[PDB]
């Protein structure tokens, strides 16, 4: 059904010690597959499906553009610094571009850029023009709308980006379509007259999950605290959900976990030890 492609890119002045200044990270359905860095200077695989099913020509081809982009984005640091009237310091440039496809056909085509954590330029596919947010984005706006860069980006987001994403999904249909059980553990702590109940899901795939605390059948999201969905090293996901309650009402509270891997929502009551 829905398949998303995203290319996260970062250009840094202060990496700082023993770290690469230029990093290009790729994503397929919210999962890391490709990576590029200023020290290695080569595009390397991160998943099994992209390493085997993709040709050697693809790796040498992506590296050619990758090395070229690194040299272009190197001068881009200085271009902004001279425009903003900056001598130096900690400054970073961010890039976010990709496509979202639904049942084959594309539904989204974005190209966004930011400087020092603030929106700089954003491409509009409909009007074929680059939107300026900061008054320092007008020279970039006049530069790209002048040549064939606007036409080339529109051709990429509608053809090149769409055609290749269909292949990436076909290559990793088993690794993206898989489902893993989270393994839920419940623990409670006694503080200054307040009982803090914790619900933890360790390793689940895909990323979306619904972990909420229930009191006497009714869902309580008013007092419940959540740290969102955090990723793991292997490729799976983790989540942290807590709730503050009065001591003695441990039987009334139940943690419900809703996931694609489970056919029915898993209930987890807090049974203590007291030993």
């Amino acid at each position: 059904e829905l398949h998303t492609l995203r290319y996260i890119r970062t250009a840094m002045t202060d990496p700082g010690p023993g770290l690469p200044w230029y990093v290009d990270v790729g994503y397929v359905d919210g999962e890391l597959f490709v990576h590029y860095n200023s020290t290695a200077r080569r595009y390397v695989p991160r998943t099994e499906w992209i390493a085997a099913k993709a040709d050697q020509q693809y790796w040498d081809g992506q590296t050619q553009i990758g090395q070229g982009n690194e040299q272009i984005d190197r001068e881009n640091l200085g271009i902004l610094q001279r425009r903003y009237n900056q001598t130096g310091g900690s400054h970073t440039v961010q890039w976010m571009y990709g496509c979202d496809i639904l049942e084959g056909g594309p539904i989204r085509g974005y190209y966004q850029m930011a400087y020092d954590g603030r929106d700089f330029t954003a491409f509009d596919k409909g009007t074929m023009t680059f939107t300026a947010a900061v008054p320092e984005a007008v020279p970039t706006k006049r530069k790209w709308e002048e040549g064939d860069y606007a036409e080339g980006l529109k051709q990429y987001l509608e053809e090149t980006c769409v055609e290749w994403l269909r292949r990436y999904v076909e290559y990793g249909k088993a690794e993206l379509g898989r489902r893993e059980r989270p393994e839920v553990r419940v623990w409670g702590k006694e503080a200054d007259g307040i009982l803090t109940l914790s619900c933890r899901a360790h390793g689940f795939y895909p990323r979306p999950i619904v972990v909420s605390w229930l009191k006497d059948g009714a869902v309580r999201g008013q007092d419940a605290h959540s740290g969102g969905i955090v990723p793991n090293g292997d490729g799976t996901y983790h989540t942290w959900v807590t709730i503050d309650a009065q001591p003695g009402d441990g039987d009334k509270y139940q943690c419900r976990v809703e996931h694609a891997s489970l056919p029915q929502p898993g209930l987890y009551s807090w049974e203590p030890r007291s030993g």
């Binding site: 990758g66 982009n69 881009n76 890039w95 020279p139 090149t160």
Partner: peptide, 8 residues
């Protein structure tokens, strides 16, 4: 496939 960058 990555898109080629241009000078600002």
């Amino acid at each position: 496939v990555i898109f080629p960058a241009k000078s600002l």
